[PDB]
Amino acid sequence: VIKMKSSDFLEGKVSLAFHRTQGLMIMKTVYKGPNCIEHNEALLEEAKMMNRLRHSRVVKLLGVIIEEGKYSLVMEYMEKGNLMHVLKAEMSTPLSVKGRIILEIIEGMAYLHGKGVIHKDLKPENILVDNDFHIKIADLGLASFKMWSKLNNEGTLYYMAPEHLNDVNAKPTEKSDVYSFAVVLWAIFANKEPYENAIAEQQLIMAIKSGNRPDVDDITEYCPREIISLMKLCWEANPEARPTFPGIEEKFRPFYLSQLE
Amino acid sequence: NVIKMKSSDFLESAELGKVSLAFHRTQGLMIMKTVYKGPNCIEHNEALLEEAKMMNRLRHSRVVKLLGVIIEEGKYSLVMEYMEKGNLMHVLKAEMSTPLSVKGRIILEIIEGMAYLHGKGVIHKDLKPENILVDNDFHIKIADLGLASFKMWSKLNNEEHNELGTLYYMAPEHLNDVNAKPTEKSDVYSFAVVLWAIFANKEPYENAIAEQQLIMAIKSGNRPDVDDITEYCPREIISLMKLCWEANPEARPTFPGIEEKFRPFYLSQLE
Ligand SMILES: CC(C)C(=O)Nc1nc2cc(-c3ccc4c(c3)c(C(=O)N[C@@H](C)c3ccccc3)cn4C)ccn2n1
Ligand SMILES: CC(C)C(=O)Nc1nc2cc(-c3ccc4c(c3)c(C(=O)N[C@@H](C)c3ccccc3)cn4C)ccn2n1
């Protein structure tokens, strides 16, 4: 990794970070407390793994600050924030830009799966948009890498595959993210969070485990048919019935090319 | 009553409110928890000393004895006996492995301490590996690091002028329900998860993804994964933990009942 120092920056919490020589970046300070040196080795290894994720649709980890009792992650800056914010903005997104966004999400998820990363929390809060309306996948909640995830701990459920609802012990798979992505598709075309009421509880968890899905009739903007088919397929209760992201890409890229671009 | 001590009774300390190893000029090593550093207040002083006398009356070989109280202008401190090897989770994750007989004894000693506290009308409310301390001989003592048992030092800790929370062991009836009164059955549930953690050498629910997910899952019956125990674990201990984390509090045994079952078992198959 690149190791940064707090003194490298102008003077969990997610903040704008001005590196005194490299400029604008994003700082997430994961932990500030009395020491835990016994953990550093595993944290720096996972950080290196973080550092190796290099893709235009994936948020890049610029540096780590590993200091006595202070753990921080430094990331590349995305101007326009997360996908939900851009969707609900006062202006609109042509269907072509939404098609391109969806393809970019597929490409990033396929890259992450090809590097052995299961995101575990794909959701609109974790899809960042740059000034040109291109996206990058992020992990604001530290869900993807286990030791940084624990250190962070030393919360929407709307995108959680039903197999993880009321069952925290089953191991998540690539199909977990495929389910999340399906709900992301719906949300992209609804410009709102699923389950119109927008309350989370045991009623809804049990409803979803039994097959309830976001209301396809709650789409009040135009949504292409093939995309509705794709999301319906991807949120199948049976994890085995859901495609892989490379399969999704072999389907969606030619459709986006022929009908959307 | 208690022993009221002075800050000047100690030569020095080293940080571990603030928890410190402190050297008493006459008594030697002790553990100091400094609860409040601020402007002076008698807003509780009388009750505070009363509560101290109360926590001083807990005298049992498996409970951390309160050694002294420091009540000074703007400074409030509790002083406890020192436990050499720290808390149970740390000892479990140590490089050297712990013999199944020693884990059996630890479990029995926890049972004994919990029985004592319940027999003196004390509901711990926060039993967990962090509150189970280990001496140099691998004997345990139950502690209350979070000031859960005595409410007004707890208030003093949170008073807005003082310059100075795991849920894996919280019985499901108190999750997302901040009003339910904890009972002895709560402490039994905590004991059940501590048993699991003793034999898995780690915290439960590692692939839990989000806190609401885990909270709703646990309230609906999810428990620690018994297969994730990868070292030998006797079958009655699996039975005991399954019984003690029963969703219905009434179905859970009591600590005198747990001890009745477990002590002969430990004698005949473990010691
Ligand atoms: C309103 C706001 C101020 C704005 O306007 N823009 C803006 N907000 C952010 C927030 C982050 C951000 C924050 C915290 C992060 C991450 C990113 C991240 C990460 O992505 N890790 C990579 C390596 C990864 C990706 C996929 C899977 C696994 C790991 C890990 N954490 C903890 C980054 C850029 N921006 N830009
Ligand atoms: C791990 C460290 C790095 C190391 O190496 N050793 C080490 N840490 C400690 C920490 C304590 C400790 C700290 C804070 C406490 C308490 C104890 C306590 C209490 O137990 N009160 C008694 C009377 C009681 C017991 C049961 C129920 C109700 C009350 C109340 N508070 C706020 C004691 C001994 N050690 N030894």
Please check whether residue A98 is in contact with residue A252, taking contact to mean a CB–CB distance below 8 angstroms.
no
SS3 B90: helix
Ligand 1 mean position, distance from CA A79 (Å):
11
Radius of gyration, CA atoms only, chain A:
19
Please check whether residue B68 is in contact with residue B112, taking contact to mean a CB–CB distance below 8 angstroms.
no
State the helix-helix crossing angle for B45-56 and B151-158, rounded to 10 degrees.
130
Residue nearest ligand 1's atom 2 by CA = A81
Ligand 2 mean position, distance from CA B57 (Å):
15
SS3 A69: coil
Interface residues of B toward A, Cβ cutoff 8 Å, are 15-16, 205-214, 216-222, 225, 228
CB contact under 8 A, A120 and B209: yes
Q: What is the largest CA-CA distance in chain B?
A: 58
Sequence-distant (≥ 6) Cβ neighbours of residue A250 within 8 angstroms: none
For the annotated catalytic residues of B, the residue numbers are 126
Please check whether residue A149 is in contact with residue A121, taking contact to mean a CB–CB distance below 8 angstroms.
no
Residue nearest ligand 1's atom 13 by CA = A140
Q: How far is C-alpha A232 from the chain's CA centre? A: 20
Beta bridge partner(s), residue A14: A28
CB contact under 8 A, B217 and A155: no
Q: Which of A150, A172, A202 has its CB closest to that of B220?
A: A202
Please check whether residue B161 is in contact with residue B39, taking contact to mean a CB–CB distance below 8 angstroms.
yes
| Letter string b/e over residues A33-62, b meaning 16 or more CB atoms within 10 A of that residue's CB | eeeeeebeeebeebbebbeebebebbbbbb
Q: Which of A121, A130, A132, A177 is catalytic?
A: A121
Answer whether A142 contacts ligand 1 (Cβ < 6 A).
Answer: yes
Q: How far apart are CA A110 and CA B220, in angstroms?
A: 34
Give this entry's resolution in angstroms.
2.6
Domain residue spans in chain B? 1-82, 83-271
Please check whether residue B122 is in contact with residue B149, taking contact to mean a CB–CB distance below 8 angstroms.
yes
Joined tokens for residue A8? 């490298």
Ligand 2 mean position, distance from CA A38 (Å):
23
Joined tokens for residue B226? 């018994």
Q: Which amino acid is at B72?
A: E
Query: What is the least distance, in Å, from the CA of A205 to any CA of chain B?
Result: 9
Residue B138 burial by CB count (10 A; 0-12/13-18/19+): exposed, middle or buried?
middle
Sequence-distant (≥ 6) Cβ neighbours of residue A25 within 8 angstroms: A17, A18, A19, A62, A74, A75, A76, A77
Please check whether residue B189 is in contact with residue B244, taking contact to mean a CB–CB distance below 8 angstroms.
yes
- Compute CA distances B100 → A181, B230, B232, B244, whole Å: 46, 13, 8, 21
DSSP annotation of A221: S
- Compute CA distances A5 → A46, A73, A155, A246, whole Å: 19, 11, 31, 39
Joined tokens for residue B143? 């502690």
Please check whether residue B41 is in contact with residue B73, taking contact to mean a CB–CB distance below 8 angstroms.
no
A19, A24, A26, A127: residue to mutate for ligand 1 pocket, most atoms within 8 A of CB = A26
Q: How far apart are CA A135 and CA A86, in angstroms?
A: 11
Task: Please calculate the CA angle A207-A213-A218 and round it to the nearest 5 degrees.
Answer: 125
Sequence-distant (≥ 6) Cβ neighbours of residue A18 within 8 angstroms: A9, A10, A24, A25
- Name the structure determination technique: X-ray
Kindly state the helix (H) or strand (E) to which residue B36 belongs, with its residue range: strand B28-37
